[PDB]
PDB file of C-alpha atoms and ligand atoms in Angstrom:
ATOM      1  CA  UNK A   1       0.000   0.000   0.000  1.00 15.00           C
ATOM      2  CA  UNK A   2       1.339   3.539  -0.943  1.00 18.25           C
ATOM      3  CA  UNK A   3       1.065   6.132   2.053  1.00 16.69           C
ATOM      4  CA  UNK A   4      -1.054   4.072   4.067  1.00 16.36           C
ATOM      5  CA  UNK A   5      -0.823   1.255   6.012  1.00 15.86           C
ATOM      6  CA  UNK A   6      -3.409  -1.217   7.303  1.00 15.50           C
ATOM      7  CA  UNK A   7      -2.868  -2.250  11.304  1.00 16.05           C
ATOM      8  CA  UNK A   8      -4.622  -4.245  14.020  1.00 17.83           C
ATOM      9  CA  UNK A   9      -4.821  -5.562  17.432  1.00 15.66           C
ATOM     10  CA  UNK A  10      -6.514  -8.299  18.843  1.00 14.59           C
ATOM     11  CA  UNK A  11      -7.445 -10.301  21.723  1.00 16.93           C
ATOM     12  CA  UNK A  12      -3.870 -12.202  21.972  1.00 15.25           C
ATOM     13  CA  UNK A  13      -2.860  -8.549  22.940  1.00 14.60           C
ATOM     14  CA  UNK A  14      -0.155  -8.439  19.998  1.00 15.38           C
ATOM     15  CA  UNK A  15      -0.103  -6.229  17.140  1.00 14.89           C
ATOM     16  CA  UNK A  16       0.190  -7.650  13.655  1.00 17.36           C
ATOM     17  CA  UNK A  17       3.050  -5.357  13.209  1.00 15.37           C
ATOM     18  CA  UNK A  18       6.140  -4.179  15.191  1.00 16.20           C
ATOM     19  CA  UNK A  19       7.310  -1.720  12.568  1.00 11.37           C
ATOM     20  CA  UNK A  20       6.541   0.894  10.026  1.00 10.25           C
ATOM     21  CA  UNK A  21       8.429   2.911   7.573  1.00 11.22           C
ATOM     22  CA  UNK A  22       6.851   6.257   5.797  1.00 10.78           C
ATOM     23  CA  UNK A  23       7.940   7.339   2.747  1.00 12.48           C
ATOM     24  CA  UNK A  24       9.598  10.634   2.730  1.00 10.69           C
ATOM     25  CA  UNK A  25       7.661  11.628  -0.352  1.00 10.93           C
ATOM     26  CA  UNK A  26       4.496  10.454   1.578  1.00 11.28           C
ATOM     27  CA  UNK A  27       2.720  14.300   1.962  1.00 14.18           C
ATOM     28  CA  UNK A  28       0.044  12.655   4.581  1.00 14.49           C
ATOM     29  CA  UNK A  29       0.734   8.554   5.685  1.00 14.93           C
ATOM     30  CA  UNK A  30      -2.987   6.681   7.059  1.00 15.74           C
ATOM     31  CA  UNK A  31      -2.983   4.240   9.701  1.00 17.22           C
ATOM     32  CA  UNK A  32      -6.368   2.163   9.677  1.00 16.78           C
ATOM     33  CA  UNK A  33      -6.802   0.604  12.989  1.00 18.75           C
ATOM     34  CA  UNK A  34      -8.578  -2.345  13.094  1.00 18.48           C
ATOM     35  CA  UNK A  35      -9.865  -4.999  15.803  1.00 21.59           C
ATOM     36  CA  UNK A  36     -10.905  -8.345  14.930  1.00 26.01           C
ATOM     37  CA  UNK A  37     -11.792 -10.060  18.475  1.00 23.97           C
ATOM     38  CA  UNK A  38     -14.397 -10.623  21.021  1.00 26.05           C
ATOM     39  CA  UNK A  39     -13.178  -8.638  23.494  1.00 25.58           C
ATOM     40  CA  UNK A  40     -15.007  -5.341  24.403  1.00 25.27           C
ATOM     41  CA  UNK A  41     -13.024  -1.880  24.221  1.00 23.48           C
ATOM     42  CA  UNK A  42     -12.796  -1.658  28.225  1.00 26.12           C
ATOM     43  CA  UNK A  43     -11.136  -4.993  28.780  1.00 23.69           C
ATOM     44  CA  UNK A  44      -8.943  -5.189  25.625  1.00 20.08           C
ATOM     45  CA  UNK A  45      -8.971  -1.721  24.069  1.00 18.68           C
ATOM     46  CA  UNK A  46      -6.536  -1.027  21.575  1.00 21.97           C
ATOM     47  CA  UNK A  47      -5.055   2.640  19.736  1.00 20.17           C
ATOM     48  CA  UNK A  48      -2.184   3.975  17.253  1.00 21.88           C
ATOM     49  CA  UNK A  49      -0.006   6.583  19.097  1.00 19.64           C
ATOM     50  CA  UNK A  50       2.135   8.522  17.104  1.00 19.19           C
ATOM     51  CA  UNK A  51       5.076  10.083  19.096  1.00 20.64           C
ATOM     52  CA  UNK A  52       9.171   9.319  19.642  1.00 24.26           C
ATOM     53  CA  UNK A  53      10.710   7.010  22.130  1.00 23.18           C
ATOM     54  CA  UNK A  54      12.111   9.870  24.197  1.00 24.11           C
ATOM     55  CA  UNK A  55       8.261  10.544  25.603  1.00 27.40           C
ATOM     56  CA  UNK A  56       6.663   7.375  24.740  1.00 26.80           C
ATOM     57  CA  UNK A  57       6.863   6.138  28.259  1.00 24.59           C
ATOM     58  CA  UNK A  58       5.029   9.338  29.737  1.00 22.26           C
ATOM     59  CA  UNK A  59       2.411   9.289  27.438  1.00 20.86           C
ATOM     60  CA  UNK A  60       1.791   5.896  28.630  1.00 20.36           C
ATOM     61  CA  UNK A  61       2.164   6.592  32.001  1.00 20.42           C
ATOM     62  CA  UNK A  62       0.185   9.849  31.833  1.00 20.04           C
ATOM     63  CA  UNK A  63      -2.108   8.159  30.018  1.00 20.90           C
ATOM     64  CA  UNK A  64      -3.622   5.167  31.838  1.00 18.59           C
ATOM     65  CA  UNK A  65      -4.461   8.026  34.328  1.00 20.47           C
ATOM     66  CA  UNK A  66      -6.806  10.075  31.759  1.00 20.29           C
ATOM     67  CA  UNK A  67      -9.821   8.194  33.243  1.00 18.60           C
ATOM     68  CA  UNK A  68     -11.474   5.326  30.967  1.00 21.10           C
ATOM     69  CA  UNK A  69     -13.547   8.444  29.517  1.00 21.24           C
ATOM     70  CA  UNK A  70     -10.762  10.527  28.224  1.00 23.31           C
ATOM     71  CA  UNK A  71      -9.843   7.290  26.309  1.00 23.10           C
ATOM     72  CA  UNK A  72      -6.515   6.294  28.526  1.00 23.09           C
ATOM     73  CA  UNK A  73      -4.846   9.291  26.693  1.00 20.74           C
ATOM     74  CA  UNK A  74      -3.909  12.574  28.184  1.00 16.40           C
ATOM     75  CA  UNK A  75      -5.735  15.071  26.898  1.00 15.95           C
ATOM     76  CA  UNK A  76      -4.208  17.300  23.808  1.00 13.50           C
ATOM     77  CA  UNK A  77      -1.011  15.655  24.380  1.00 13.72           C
ATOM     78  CA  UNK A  78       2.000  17.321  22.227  1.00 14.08           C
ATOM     79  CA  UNK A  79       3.945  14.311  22.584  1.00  9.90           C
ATOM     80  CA  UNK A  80       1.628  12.633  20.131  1.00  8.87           C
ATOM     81  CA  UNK A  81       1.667  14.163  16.509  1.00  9.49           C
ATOM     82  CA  UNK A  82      -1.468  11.576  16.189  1.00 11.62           C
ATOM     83  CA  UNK A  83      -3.315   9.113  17.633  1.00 13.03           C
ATOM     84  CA  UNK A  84      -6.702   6.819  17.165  1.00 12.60           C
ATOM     85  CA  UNK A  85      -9.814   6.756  19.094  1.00 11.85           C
ATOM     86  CA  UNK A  86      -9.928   3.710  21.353  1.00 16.20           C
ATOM     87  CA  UNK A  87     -12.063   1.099  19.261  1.00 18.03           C
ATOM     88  CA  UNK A  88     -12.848  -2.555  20.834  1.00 17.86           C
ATOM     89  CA  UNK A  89     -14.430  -5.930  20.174  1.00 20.75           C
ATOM     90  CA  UNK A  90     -15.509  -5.729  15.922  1.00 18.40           C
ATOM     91  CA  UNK A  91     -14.763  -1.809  16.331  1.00 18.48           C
ATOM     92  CA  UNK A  92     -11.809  -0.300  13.506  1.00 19.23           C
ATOM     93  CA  UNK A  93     -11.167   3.278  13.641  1.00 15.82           C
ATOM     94  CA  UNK A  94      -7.832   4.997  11.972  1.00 15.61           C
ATOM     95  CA  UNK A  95      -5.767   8.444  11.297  1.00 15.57           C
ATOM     96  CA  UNK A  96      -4.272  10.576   9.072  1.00 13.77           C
ATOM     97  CA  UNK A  97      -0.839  12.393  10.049  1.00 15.86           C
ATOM     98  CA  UNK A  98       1.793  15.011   8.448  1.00 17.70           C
ATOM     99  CA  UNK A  99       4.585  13.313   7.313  1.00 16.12           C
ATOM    100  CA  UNK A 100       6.160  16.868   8.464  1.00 13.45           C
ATOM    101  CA  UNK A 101       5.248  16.310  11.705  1.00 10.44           C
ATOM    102  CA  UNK A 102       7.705  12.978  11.366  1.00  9.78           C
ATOM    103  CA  UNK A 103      10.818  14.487  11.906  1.00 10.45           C
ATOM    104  CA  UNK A 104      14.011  12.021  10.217  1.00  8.34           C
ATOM    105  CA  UNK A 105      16.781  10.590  12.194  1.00  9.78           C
ATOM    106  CA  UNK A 106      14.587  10.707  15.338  1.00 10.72           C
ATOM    107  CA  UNK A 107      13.339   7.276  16.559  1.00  9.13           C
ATOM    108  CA  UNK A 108       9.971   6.631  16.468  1.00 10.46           C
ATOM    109  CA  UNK A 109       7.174   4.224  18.471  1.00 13.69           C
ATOM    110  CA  UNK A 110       3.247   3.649  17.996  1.00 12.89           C
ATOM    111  CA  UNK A 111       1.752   2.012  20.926  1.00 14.06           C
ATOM    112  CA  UNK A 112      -1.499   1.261  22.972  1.00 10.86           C
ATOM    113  CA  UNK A 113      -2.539   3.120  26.179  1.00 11.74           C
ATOM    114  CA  UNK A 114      -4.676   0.876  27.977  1.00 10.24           C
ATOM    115  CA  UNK A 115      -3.214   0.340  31.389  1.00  8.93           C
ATOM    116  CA  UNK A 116      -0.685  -2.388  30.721  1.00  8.48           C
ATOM    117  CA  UNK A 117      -1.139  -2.456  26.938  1.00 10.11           C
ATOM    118  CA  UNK A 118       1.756  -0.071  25.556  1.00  7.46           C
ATOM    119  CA  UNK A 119       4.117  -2.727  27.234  1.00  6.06           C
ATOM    120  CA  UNK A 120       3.280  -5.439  24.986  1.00  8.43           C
ATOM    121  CA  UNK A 121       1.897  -4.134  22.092  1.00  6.86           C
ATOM    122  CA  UNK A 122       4.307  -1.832  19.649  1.00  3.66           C
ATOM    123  CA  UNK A 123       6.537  -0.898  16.741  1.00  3.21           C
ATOM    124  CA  UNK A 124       9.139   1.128  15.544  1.00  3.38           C
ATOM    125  CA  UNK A 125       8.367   3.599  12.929  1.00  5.40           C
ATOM    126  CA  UNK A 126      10.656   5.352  10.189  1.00  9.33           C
ATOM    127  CA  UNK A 127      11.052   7.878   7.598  1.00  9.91           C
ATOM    128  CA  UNK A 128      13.247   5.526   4.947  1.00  6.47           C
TER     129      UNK A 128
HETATM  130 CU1   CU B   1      -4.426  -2.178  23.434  1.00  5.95          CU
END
């Protein structure tokens, strides 16, 4: 797939994925989120975080403390160029980001939120 790429998350709480790499031509990259299990959203929730290594972990962290409401994501955090919503169980949900927001030679990791989910579930992405 050109400038998009076509993710998901399941039950087995592993991505399908542990990587990406944008194309530096790519004027606006897509990540379609999707979730094929039986699992609701508030027991196995899954989301795309876009934003470097060197805040990943606070993000997380300061993110399975915005409630269950504000999606386990701190609200208009910087250190996320974008993000998904929190889909569930059949749910698929996605996002569209600058690829001038996706600075080179700066590492890169997409992750879930969900108290205890970001640990397992990731990838590195790049700007190739
Ligand atoms: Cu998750």
């Amino acid at each position: 797939a050109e400038c998009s790429v076509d993710i998901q998350g399941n039950d087995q709480m592993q991505f399908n994925t542990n990587a990406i790499t944008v194309d530096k031509s790519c004027k606006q990259f897509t990540v379609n989120l999707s979730h094929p299990g039986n699992l609701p959203k508030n027991v196995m929730g899954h989301s795309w975080v876009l934003s470097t290594a060197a805040d990943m972990q606070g993000v997380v962290t300061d993110g399975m403390a915005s409630g269950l409401d504000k999606d386990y994501l701190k609200p208009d955090d910087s250190r996320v160029i974008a993000h998904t919503k929190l889909i569930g169980s059949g749910e698929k949900d996605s996002v569209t980001f600058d690829v001038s927001k996706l600075k080179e030679g700066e590492q890169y990791m997409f992750f879930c939120t969900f108290p205890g989910h970001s640990a397992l579930l990731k990838g590195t992405l790049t700007l190739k």
